[PDB]
Amino acid sequence: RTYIVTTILEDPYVMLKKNANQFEGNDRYEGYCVELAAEIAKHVGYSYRLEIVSDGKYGARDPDTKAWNGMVGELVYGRADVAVAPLTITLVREEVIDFSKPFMSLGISIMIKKPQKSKPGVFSFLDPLAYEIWMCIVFAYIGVSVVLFLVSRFSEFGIFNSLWFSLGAFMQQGCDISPRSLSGRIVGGVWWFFTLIIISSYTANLAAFLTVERMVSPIESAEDLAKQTEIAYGTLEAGSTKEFFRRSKIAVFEKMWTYMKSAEPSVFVRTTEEGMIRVRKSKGKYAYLLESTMNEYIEQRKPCDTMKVGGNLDSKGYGIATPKGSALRNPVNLAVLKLNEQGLLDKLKNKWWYDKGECGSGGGDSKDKTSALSLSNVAGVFYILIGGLGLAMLVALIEFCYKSR
Amino acid sequence: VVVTTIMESPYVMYKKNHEMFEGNDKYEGYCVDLASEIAKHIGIKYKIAIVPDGKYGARDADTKIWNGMVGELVYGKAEIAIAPLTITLVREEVIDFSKPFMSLGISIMIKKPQKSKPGVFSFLDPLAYEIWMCIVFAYIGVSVVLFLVSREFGIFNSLWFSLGAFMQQGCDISPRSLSGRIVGGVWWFFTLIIISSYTANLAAFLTVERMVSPIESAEDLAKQTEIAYGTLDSGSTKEFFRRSKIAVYEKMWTYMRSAEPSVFTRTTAEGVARVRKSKGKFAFLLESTMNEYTEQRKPCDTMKVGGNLDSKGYGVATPKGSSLRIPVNLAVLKLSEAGVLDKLKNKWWYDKGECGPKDSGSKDKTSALSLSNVAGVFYILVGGLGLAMLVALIEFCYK
Amino acid sequence: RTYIVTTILEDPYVMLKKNANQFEGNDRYEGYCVELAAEIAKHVGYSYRLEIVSDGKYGARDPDTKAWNGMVGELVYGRADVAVAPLTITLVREEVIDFSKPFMSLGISIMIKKPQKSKPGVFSFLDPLAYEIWMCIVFAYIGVSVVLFLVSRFSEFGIFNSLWFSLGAFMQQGCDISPRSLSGRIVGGVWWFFTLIIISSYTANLAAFLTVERMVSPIESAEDLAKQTEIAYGTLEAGSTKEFFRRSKIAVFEKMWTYMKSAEPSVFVRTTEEGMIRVRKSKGKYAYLLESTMNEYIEQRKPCDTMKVGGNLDSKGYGIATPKGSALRNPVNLAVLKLNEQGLLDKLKNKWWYDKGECGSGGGDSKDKTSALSLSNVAGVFYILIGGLGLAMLVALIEFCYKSR
Amino acid sequence: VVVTTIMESPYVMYKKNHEMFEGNDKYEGYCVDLASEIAKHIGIKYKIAIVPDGKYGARDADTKIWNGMVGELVYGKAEIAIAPLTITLVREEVIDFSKPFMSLGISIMIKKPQKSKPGVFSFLDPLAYEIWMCIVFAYIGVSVVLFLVSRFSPNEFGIFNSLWFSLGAFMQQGCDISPRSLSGRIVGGVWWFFTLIIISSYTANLAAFLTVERMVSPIESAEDLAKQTEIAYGTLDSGSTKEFFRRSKIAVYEKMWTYMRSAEPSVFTRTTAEGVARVRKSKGKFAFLLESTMNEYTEQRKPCDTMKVGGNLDSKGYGVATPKGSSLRIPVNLAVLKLSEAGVLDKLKNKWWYDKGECGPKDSGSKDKTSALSLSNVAGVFYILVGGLGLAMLVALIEFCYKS
Amino acid sequence: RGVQMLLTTVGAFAAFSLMTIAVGTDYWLYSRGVCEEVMTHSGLWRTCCLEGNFKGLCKQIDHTAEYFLRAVRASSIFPILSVILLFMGGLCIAASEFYKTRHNIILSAGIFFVSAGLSNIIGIIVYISANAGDPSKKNSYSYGWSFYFGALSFIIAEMVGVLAVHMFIDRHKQL
Amino acid sequence: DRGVQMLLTTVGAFAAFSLMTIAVGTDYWLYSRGVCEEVMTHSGLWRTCCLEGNFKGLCKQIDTAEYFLRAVRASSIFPILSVILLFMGGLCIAASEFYKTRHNIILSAGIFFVSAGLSNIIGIIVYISANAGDPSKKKNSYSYGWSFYFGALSFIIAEMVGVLAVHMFIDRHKQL
Ligand SMILES: O=c1[nH]c2cc(C(F)(F)F)c(N3CCOCC3)cc2n(CP(=O)(O)O)c1=O
Ligand SMILES: O=c1[nH]c2cc(C(F)(F)F)c(N3CCOCC3)cc2n(CP(=O)(O)O)c1=O
Ligand SMILES: O=c1[nH]c2cc(C(F)(F)F)c(N3CCOCC3)cc2n(CP(=O)(O)O)c1=O
């Protein structure tokens, strides 16, 4: 005889047929769930006919005023054989049917936008100061140079020679020219004091910037997110995450639930893709807790700007719904447990979740954090160096052009 | 049972959903939750009501009546007052009070302490004044001793050699004596070590940018500080300040009397608006309850408690000849002992806050150095250049 | 008719007179509660004849075989009417007797060892860069000096001249001396590079040392104490503090209650004096979580090493005990309320807690908090510098001998 | 009602030494508290009986007898068994398994690093890697260009004189003769500006590197562990990990199996205790690979030097067992699921796993260690100094040989 | 050497023109201040607003070492001394263009240019310390080309002064 | 005034030789709190022994840019080179005080004193980078013993003779 298997239209686990019309029938769906269904049908031995639930929702066994729906409702109403589908293990759906075995582990995990900062060139050069500061340094240089020339010619010195000595005196570099007379002596003294205090201040400021850049705390697990209190976090109004938040018993989990229940920014989410768009548009100012399978799906198939961090906060399993009093209960349990222990189920998971993913986080080498510099903040240094080198060479040649003319 | 309550900020409030329910379930706050807790403890049907008079409860002392809650309780209008009431001498012979469920007193409150932006002091903020007068004395001594030990170093050549060595430079002429070599090496080494110490101190200061509490941190420092101090016109604070026996509060009273008459403010809203406009101005010596209220509201800038002064008591009123006096006394004592009113106070005063940065400190970006911390450098630069030009002009006039 | 009062002596209430037993008895009592009893007896009118406590303990409910003891036990079991000595407020005391009013508002307090440290002299100079590296870099300097003499005079430049050039090269001041042979230039350049890196390393290490030294903050409040694990804390088993810690349900209180629940070291002590001397012996990491009044009393003691930090975690109160139906219940309540509002209680507290204290007469002895390098860190340099000057003066006179003898 | 467990696991512990809490309830731990909770849920009598087999259980096909708790159930001496029991096919086809109460995985383990004390690399540690040969390239270029400037203008500077002047400018002390040319002012000032900004950057970078430490772990993933091939890896002589490695299918695991195939220093450890002792003795190699639960248990043991890097190689779990279907089977299944969905089970698990270990009480790191720079952070600079001085004497000797 | 004297002439007249346009007309800085984020034209006596609900009105603007620097930043006494000082300098440039024999007025004029450049740059730093050293609460430090006219009043005054000194180390040879 | 200078060089070089003998033969190098546990040990460059403990009386010998220096520390090869060329320097200054005609013999002598200084520094730095170069080493440490300061004294008298014997070269060369 034939058998019917029911499959929920879920984004990470099943694809609608891109070719659609010209290849219809059994080959209308491609994904992890339908591949697992085909494999277990080849193992146990039967024929599968694909079916779609009417309401398009997972459903629940809430004690409402009748009107039971969902996949468990489709199974209990009698118009089903086996429900090969994602199904979170819970008490309300255990009292009427039994689940076979957990083949994958679910845990609510935080996601965060990938921090990508591009180190500039000449912009990062004068970064640990002010443009104001640099323009006053340049103008103080040229003013002190001209007044040093004035006092040297007023009390043996050229403007070129005065520029040489002012450069050396501002620059903490020695020279063979000395400020004769006490007025030039005290101008030189004030100049060395000024340039020493500026160089000390700049070194202190850049050291402070490097220290505060290094002394940073990246977010790991849930405790750091609980104690950072800077990035807002929230979940859907209903679902497994909300039910876990209401029934939270851990002290830290109760703390984060109270922080979320303060509701200063509220949940600010309606659907999963709406929250995904919001957190990608929040520039790292928002956080979302979601099921780790969606997190790995977004890490690869979505554009590479959101990433996973931390472990699973809870341990919940999966399964495929089976009737309580049917003959298709124990052999399918043995088959799914055999495929779990064999590793071919893991092979299918890796094949569907790593190969056909449009991102390069796991298919290529990452960036090794060797600290220190990376020839980025000091590129403008050698840039203005070689610019001054070329300027000096060309002014030497126009001097030689004066010689030749 | 019916209880009357004054419209006050930290106890009861008109809910935003005014049309949700009219009657008992229309107020949320400390007072209604405390009343619900004690009603669940003893067992009674409780409601809520607002004072028709609007007064907090005091005696006019001329009409032989009390103006407010105790006035309507004595003259037969209510049988319980869960709204807070500080216990004083006059309200004991006509009303009964239980054990204090909360402790309050007169505490100081100042403005937000921010980083200073000095002109000349920013140049010398690392190290201290003493070490720099010591270093200029040492500079003079070293210059004069190396001038005398060489007798080409005259009374200006030796000074220029010392000056060039003092900011890590060289010189055209070097001596040939062993004593000169020793003094030059030791002065160079001292100069280098103190510049290294200065730059380390400046780097640490700039990377930590840690704020320090101002001078107004204790009663004696408040008495010794020139900053202004203001309080309300009349009330519990004025009554306490009128008569004292500590002789430091007498000094505070004399300071208030001899200062400007602007230290008296009509309302606490006007007072906080006055203190908000400046980092100094007049700071307050007000109730700890209102201080805790104001520190966790929307403008989280003034959040300073400082020391604690005086001792008062918040109690629940009870009319005379009532059989529930002992019951409410044991109820409030069991509450304050076992602990749910303290939990409620925590959840409504610290957990219920617009800003959470007061509980745990955070960091800030160092940003650009700006010019506030550097303008002293250019000020001493222009001072030196002006002095040099003045001495050059007078030297031209001199010779 | 005459009246009696019962008192309990631990500290500093019913202190015996310094003249021992030469006085008349109850008049030989210097303290807080005895003066309060005398004043409150003068207020309403009754005899203040002291009664000897039977056991010396404050007493408890004693659930075994019921009954009572202490001042409350004497009050319930006849021959006692007025108890002036302070005692805390709890449920079992109110269940039997009634109090008038609390005459201060106290709570449990936290104490720490007073931070005492002395900055060194010449030792703080060689603090951030060890001791052996200075000796071997002096060895390297003198070796480079002598081998520079060899290379300069092997291919002017005497041993004195080589010593001068190496001294000016070891720490970047500059000189008019310059080598001519290429080997001399090479060795000078290697020396310059080495000592430049040494000075940069010293500056970096010193900046790091001040940063990490002043980065640490004093312990305060309860949440920072809970997050701190290297500072340690605890309480006594036979006391109300342990019962308050166990019976609390607030998250932070339960948090550190769980913390010292698994107390592997010998945290718990027997008496207050034993815990206090254990704090003094350790002085680096321990706490007792003792009362506010006892903390202020220990703070004003001759060894001068305990200080109050933080605030009151709870809102406990004192009181005076009166029986039911007595004629001295309402008048004593009015008397204690009058004393509370008059301020004479504050006068007595300041007199018997601050004025008579042999320690901390000027409590504000260290409050400047000058977070800058004072004349206690680098001033040892100012010693050796002038000492070098002194040595210079010495070598001056001997070379004066070289030019005069 | 008889229930069984194993004393050779971090789930039970002997109370005191002997004759402590006599009767039935003697041992405390995670599994017995779980059994107490499910007994309070459904209602059952308790037991402390332990099978004397010792081994957890195996499929002895030759003798057709199961050892330990599984045999004691299938051949019949009890009805309930709560213990750490992995779920596989051969134990499932005789005894059913309920939903696992805690996730399981196999992870690698490396010893805790203490410090890094290199030689020339210690000097080479701050400020990038490419900067030094960039610096010497820039030095050679600026020296040859400034020599061209001094020679093309018709001065008192040869190649060696220009090189020494450029170095003395680079070392921020001075020189003897300035070029004193209107062309040379720009190049001299620009190179001075370069050397001052680079010494400031070097000093500040060294200060930032020294003020705090982060200590990036040598490994962070199993794929990188296979790729690096510098730290020895050994699972165990035989067991679940060896069986999984011998019959794996994911692509990198065959290369891992070939890596263990050429096993020189006896990576097949006989016992787990010997393996953890060996990896605690030496941190340079012999890194371990074991289950996640035993790893997290060793994380809270007295030595306090062991971490995990994250990522689970495999997925299994521990479940309760019951011989055949009866009234107790569905009852214990629903009790286990009711405790799993509720927050009591993971509360008990993480509470009892994190209170007994003093090592993890100090979370993150401790900043109360300033120390001082010993020779190890400086000996590279001392060594390049002494090498330069020896090379200066070598070139002086060969110059004496060449010229005289 | 008439090229040097005509350089002094053109430099002095250009300096006078740029100081007139800079301090006589409110064109100093661009900002997002309140008159809201509106550009403002602030000079010495009168600050003009350009947008907002207050469009069309231009408002007369008022205003041991901290008091001195506050008075300097408010009253602009160092800019006032600079502009008066270089007005006297321009007067003696006109005199030197007419009278080519007097010596003290033109060397003194050299001192007037260098001192006026110093006074202008310290007026710049004191006003930018009234704006940045007194931040109140990116584009705040925006120079609306009149701070660049002050920068010219520094640098091209330095150029004309140094070429005047070049004429003066040669006038010492001339006399 | 040169005869007293040759006497000073002779006595300084003989002092250096005696310091080499007391450094190689004996083991008073450092007062390390080793195990014989923290107790004073006489750990030599050639012979490490204890003074207390439960096995006092029996003792034995010690042993791409790091293997060479570990081999040096195991073999003590730069101190061996230093003492070998110091013995060679003693032999050549004995020849110089016997043969006053030749001049390059004191050139060789000077290069042995300076190479002795460099090799002694190299040996003491690798010794201290294997001594203070172990982060494991330990409540009581440092406080180096008397022969560490005797090696420092050997360096300072090597510097003294490298001043005065090089001055012999200077005044003999201007004499030459
Ligand atoms: O016993 C008294 N206790 C009081 C307690 C408080 C409060 F702080 F709210 F707790 C106040 N608030 C002061 C600020 O404005 C709102 C009312 C007034 C009180 N008054 C009136 P006073 O006569 O003006 O002191 C009393 O009499
Ligand atoms: O009424 C009471 N008042 C108490 C007052 C004090 C003190 F603070 F010293 F004044 C103390 N000390 C606590 C510190 O160790 C020495 C005794 C105990 C008291 N107890 C017994 P508890 O149950 O140990 O608190 C009471 O019952
Ligand atoms: O069902 C099983 N559950 C097991 C559970 C554990 C663990 F939880 F870790 F304690 C272990 N440990 C392996 C490492 O040394 C200690 C014992 C072995 C198990 N084995 C035997 P395997 O076949 O060697 O894995 C089983 O059969």
B253 token code pair: 């009273």
Q: Do F65 and D119 touch (CB under 8 A)?
A: yes
Contact B156, A178 (CB under 8 A): no
What are A229's two structure tokens?
């209190």
Find, among B376, B391, B370, B314, the residue nearest to B345 by Cα. Answer: B314
Tokens linked to A205? 């400021």
Phi, psi values for residue D96, rounded to 5°: -75, 160
- Bridge partners (DSSP) listed for residue C50: C5
Contact between B179 and C396 using a beta-carbon 8 Å cutoff: yes
Under DSSP, is residue F106 helix (H, G, I), strand (E, B) or coil?
helix
Sort out which chain A residues have CB atoms less than 8 A from B202's CB and list them. Answer: 200-201, 204
> Within this chain, do residues A113 and A248 fall inside the same structural domain, yes or no?
yes
Query: Could you tell me the two tokens for A218?
Result: 């990246």
Q: What angle do CA C341, C346, C348 make, to 5 degrees?
A: 120
Q: Does C240 count as an annotated binding residue? A: yes
Write out the DSSP string of B227-260: SEEEEESSSHHHHHHHS-SSSSHHHHHHHHHHS-
How many residue contacts between A and C have a Cβ separation below 8 Å?
A: 8
Distance CA D73, CA D56 (A): 13
User: How does DSSP assign B355-376, residue by residue?
Assistant: --TTTS---------TTTTTHH
Q: Locate C326 and state its tokens.
A: 């007595």
CA distance B310 to B107: 8
Cβ atoms of D286 and D278 within 8 Å: the answer is yes
* Separation CA B35–CA B82 (nearest Å): 6
* Nearest atom within ligand 3 for CA of residue D272: 15
User: Nearest Cα to C52, choosing from C20, C32, C25?
Assistant: C25
How far is residue B343's CA from residue B349's CA, in Å, rounded to a whole number? Answer: 10
**How many beta carbons lie within 10 A of that of residue A204, not counting itself?**
27
Closest alpha carbon to D345 in D112, D98, D120: D98
Residues of C in contact with B220 (CB under 8 A): 364
Give the separation between CA E95 and CA E93, rounded to whole angstroms: 5
Please give the DSSP secondary-structure letter assigned to residue B261: G
Q: Which two tokens stand for residue B239?
A: 């009554």
Question: Is residue A273 domain-resident?
Answer: yes
The sign of the torsion formed by the CA atoms of C142, C147, C150, C156 equals: negative
CB C139 within 8 A of CB C175: no
Minimum-distance CB partner of B170 among C89, C174, C386: C174
The two tokens of residue A70 are 């969902």
Q: Answer yes or no: do D308 and D326 share one domain.
A: no
- Cβ atoms < 10 Å from Cβ of D324: 12
Q: Are residues B98 and B32 in the same domain?
A: yes
CB B52 within 8 A of CB B73: no
- Inter-residue contact A8 to A318 (CB < 8 Å): no
Q: List the CATH number of the domain containing C300.
A: 3.40.190.10
* Residue F129 distance to chain C (closest CA, Å): 11
How far is residue A54's CA from residue B296's CA, in Å, rounded to a whole number?
Answer: 52
Closest CA to D176 of C177, C165, C188, C173: C177
Question: Can you give the resolution of this entry in Å?
Answer: 4.2
For residues B133 and B161, state if they share a domain: yes
The parent domain of residue B13 ranges over 4-103+314-346
Q: Cβ contacts of residue A44 below 8 Å, gap of 6+?
A: A328, A331, A332, A335
Neighbours of chain E (3+ CB pairs under 8 A): A, B
Q: Which-ligand-closest: CA of D57?
A: 3
Chain A residues contacting E via beta carbons under 8 Å: 130-132, 135-136, 139-140, 142-143, 146-147, 149-150, 153, 159
3-state DSSP assignment of residue F143: coil
Which residues of chain B have a CB within 8 Å of the CB of E125? 371, 375, 378
- 3-class DSSP state of A233: strand
Lookup: tokens for D115: 């410090």
Q: How far apart are CA C224 and CA A198, in angstroms?
A: 39
CA of C9 to the centre of ligand 3 (A): 64
Output the domain CATH number for residue D195: 1.10.287
Instruction: Please tell me the residue having the least CA distance from ligand 3 atom 27.
Output: D57
- Which ligand 3 atom minimizes the distance to the CA of D271? 15
Answer whether F114's CB lies under 8 Å from D396's CB: no
Whether residue C225 is found in the same domain as residue C287: yes
* Interface mutation target, options A126, A180, A196, A224, chain B, most CBs of B under 10 Å: A196
- D355 in contact with chain C, both atoms CB, cutoff 8 A: yes
Considering only CA atoms, which of E51, E73, E78 is closest in space to residue E62?
A: E73
Q: Nearest-CA residue of chain B relative to D173?
A: B169
Residues of C in contact with A251 (CB under 8 A): 251, 254-255
Alpha carbons F72 and F123: distance in angstroms, whole number:
8
Whole-angstrom distance, CA of residue A56 vs CA of residue A42: 27
Q: Do C186 and D375 touch (CB under 8 A)?
A: no
- Total count of residues recorded for chain B: 399
CA–CA separation, A216 and A228 (whole Å): 12
For the CA of C11, the nearest ligand: 2
Question: Measured over all CA atoms, what is the biggest interatomic distance in chain F, rounded to whole angstroms?
Answer: 65
Residues of B in contact with D174 (CB under 8 A): 170
Cα B279–Cα B282–Cα B285 angle in degrees, nearest 5: 115
Distance CA(A323)–CA(A325), nearest Å, equals: 6
Within 10 angstroms of residue E154's Cβ, the number of other Cβ atoms is: 21
Residues with Cβ within 8 Å of residue A284, at least 6 apart in sequence: A112, A113, A115, A231
Pick the closest to residue D295 from D230, D241, D218 (CA basis): D241
Q: How many CA atoms lie within 13 A of C210 on its CB side?
A: 29
CB D85 less than 6 A from any atom of ligand 3: yes
CB contact under 8 A, A150 and E132: no
The residue with tokens 């034939």 is A2
A242, β-bridge pairs: none
Mark yes or no for CB contact D385/C191 under 8 Å: yes
Residue type (1 letter), A289: L
Q: Can you tell me which residue has the tokens 């009893």?
A: C37
Instruction: Compute, in angstroms, the gap from residue C208 CA to the centroid of ligand 3.
Output: 49
Place of tokens 């409780």: B46
Instruction: Please judge whether D174 and C169 are an interchain contact, meaning their C-beta atoms are less than 8 angstroms apart.
Output: no
B231 CA from centroid of ligand 1 (Å): 13
Q: How far apart are CA B389 and CA F94, in angstroms?
A: 70
Q: What is the CATH number of the domain that holds C132?
A: 1.10.287.70
Q: How far is the CA of D63 from the centre of ligand 2 (A)?
A: 72
| CB D220 within 8 Å of CB D193 | no
3-state SS string for chain D: CCCCCCCCCCCCCCCCCCCCCCCCCCCCCHHHHHHHHHHHHHCCCCCCCCCCCCCCCCEECCCCEECCHHHHHHCCCCCCECCCCECCHHHHCCCEECCCCCEECEEEEECCCCCCCCCHHHHHCCCCCCHHHHHHHHHHHHHHHHHHHHHHCCCCCCHHHHHHHHHHHHCCCCCCCCCCCCCHHHHHHHHHHHHHHHHHHHHHHHHHHHHCCCCCCCCCCHHHHHHHCCCCEECCCCCHHHHHHHCCCCHHHHHHHHHHHCCCCCCCCCCHHHHHHHHHHCCCCCEEEEEHHHHHHHCCCCCCCCECCCCCCCCEEECCEECCCCCCHHHHHHHHHHHHHCCHHHHHHHHHHHHCCCCCCCCCCCCCCCCCCCHHHCHHHHHHHHHHHHHHHHHHHHHHHHHC
What's the B64 CA to ligand 2 centre distance in angstroms?
45
- The amino acid occupying position D351 is K
Chain D residues in contact with B203 by the CB 8 A cut-off are: 204, 207
Please indicate if any CB of chain D lies within 8 Å of the CB of B170.
yes
User: Coil, strand or helix: which one is B99?
Assistant: coil
Determine, yes or no, domain membership for B33: yes
Nearest CA among A389, D226, B130 for reference residue C382? B130
The size of the A-D interface in CB pairs under 8 A is 205
Tell me, using a 6 A CB cutoff, whether residue C90 lines ligand 2.
no
From start to end of A204-310, where are the E strands?
Answer: 232-234, 286-291, 306-308
- The letter for the amino acid at A42 is K
Give the tokens for residue C50: 């002291």
Q: B147: which residues sit within 8 A by CB, 6+ positions away?
A: B153, B154, B155, B158, B159
Interval between CA B328 and ligand 2 midpoint (Å): 26
Q: Give the ligand 2 atom nearest the CA of C86.
A: 3
Is residue B121 one of the residues assigned to a domain? no
The one-letter code for the residue type at C261 is: K
Per-residue DSSP letter, B68: S
Q: Quick one: A246 and A276 in the same domain?
A: yes
Considering only CA atoms, which residue is closest to atom 1 of ligand 1? B86
**How many C-alpha atoms does D390 have within 13 Å on its Cβ side?**
14
Residue E57, by phi and psi: left (phi above 0), alpha (psi -120 to 50) or beta? Answer: beta
Domain boundary among B292, B312, B332: B312
CA nearest ligand 1 atom 15, residue: B268
What the block records as the tokens of D200 is 């400031």
Same-domain check for residues C166 and C156: yes
| Closest ligand 1 atom, residue B91 Cα | 1
For residue E3, report the distance from its CA to the centre of ligand 2, in Å: 100
Residue from B368, C208, A200 nearest D206 by CA: C208
Whether B399 is in a domain gets the answer no
Examine the domain organization and report whether C66 and C44 are in the same domain: yes
Task: Report the 3 state secondary structure along chain C.
Answer: CCCEEECCCCCCCCEECCCCCCCCCCCCEECHHHHHHHHHHHHHCCCCEEECCCCCCCCCCCCCCCCCCHHHHHHHCCCCCEECCCCCCCHHHHHHCEECCCCCECCECEEEECCCCCCCCHHHHCCCCCCHHHHHHHHHHHHHHHHHHHHHCCCCCCHHHHHHHHHHHCCCCCCCCCCCCHHHHHHHHHHHHHHHHHHHHHHHHHHHHHHHHHHCCCCCCCHHHHHCCCCCCCCCCCCHHHHHHHHCCCHHHHHHHHHHHCCCCCCCCCCHHHHHHHHHHHCCCCCCCCEHHHHHHHHCCCCCCEEEECCCCCCCECCCEECCCCCCCHHHHHHHHHHHHHCHHHHHHHHHHHHCCCCCCCCCCCCCCCCCCCCCCCHHHHHHHHHHHHHHHHHHHHHHHHCCC
Please indicate whether, in this complex, the C-beta atoms of D190 and A105 are within 8 angstroms of each other.
no
A256 with A113, same domain: the answer is yes
In 10 A of CB B49, how many CB atoms?
Answer: 13
Query: Among candidates B72, B114, B115, which has minimal Cα distance to B94?
Result: B72
Q: In chain D, whose CA is at the least distance from the CA of F67?
A: D119
Method by which this entry was solved: cryo-EM
Count Cβ atoms within 10 A of the Cβ of residue A221 and give its class: 0-12 exposed, 13-18 middle, 19 or more buried.
Answer: middle
Tell me, yes or no, whether A61 and A45 share the same domain.
yes
Report residue B365 as tokens.
């970006």
CA distance E58 to chain B (A): 27
Distance of CA E148 to the CA centre of its chain: 10
Identity of the residue numbered C11:
D
Which of F16, F43, F41 has its CA nearest to residue F119? Answer: F16
Residue B285 forms part of a structural domain: yes
Examine residue B338 and state whether it is found in any structural domain, yes or no.
Answer: yes
Query: Is A324 among the domain residues?
Result: yes
**Contact status, residue B3 vs residue B35, Cβ threshold 8 Å:** yes
Chains A and D touch (3+ CB pairs under 8 A): yes
Q: Using a CB-CB distance cutoff of 8 angstroms, which residues of chain D are in contact with residue C201?
A: 206, 373, 377-378, 381
Which of 228-257 (B) contact C at CB < 8 A? 240, 243-246
Residue C287 lies in a domain: yes
Whether ligand 1 lies within 6 angstroms of the CB of B373 is answered as no
How many B/D residue pairs have CB atoms within 8 Å? 4
User: What is the spatial distance between Cα D191 and Cα D193, in angstroms, rounded to a whole number?
Assistant: 5
C324 and chain B in contact, CB less than 8 A? no
**Domains identified in chain C, total number:** 3
Question: In sequence order, what are the residues at sequence separation of 6 or more whose Cβ sits closer than 8 angstroms to the Cβ of residue C54?
Answer: C69, C73, C74
User: Which of B130, B174, B220 is the closest to C364 by Cβ?
Assistant: B220
**In which order are the strands placed within the sheet that holds A232-234?**
A232-234, A286-291, A108-113, A306-308
Last residue of a domain, one of A192, A215, A238: A215
B92: nearest CB among C164, C199, C334: C334
**Phi, psi at residue D66, to the nearest 5°?**
-90, 140
Size of chain D in residues: 404
> Among A122, A170, A180, which Cα is nearest to A142's?
A170
Q: Any idea which ligand is nearest the CA of C86?
A: 2
Do residue B218 and residue B164 come from a single domain?
no
Q: Can you state the angle between helices A131-154 and E104-131, rounded to 10 degrees?
A: 160
Domains of chain F: 3-63+68-175 (1.20.140.150)
Rounded to the nearest angstrom, the distance between the alpha carbon of D85 and the centre of ligand 3 is 7
Is C26 found in the same domain as C67?
yes
Q: Which residues of F touch D215 (CB under 8 A)?
A: none
Whether residue B236 has its Cβ less than 6 Å from ligand 1: yes
Report the DSSP pairing between strands A232-234 and A286-291. parallel
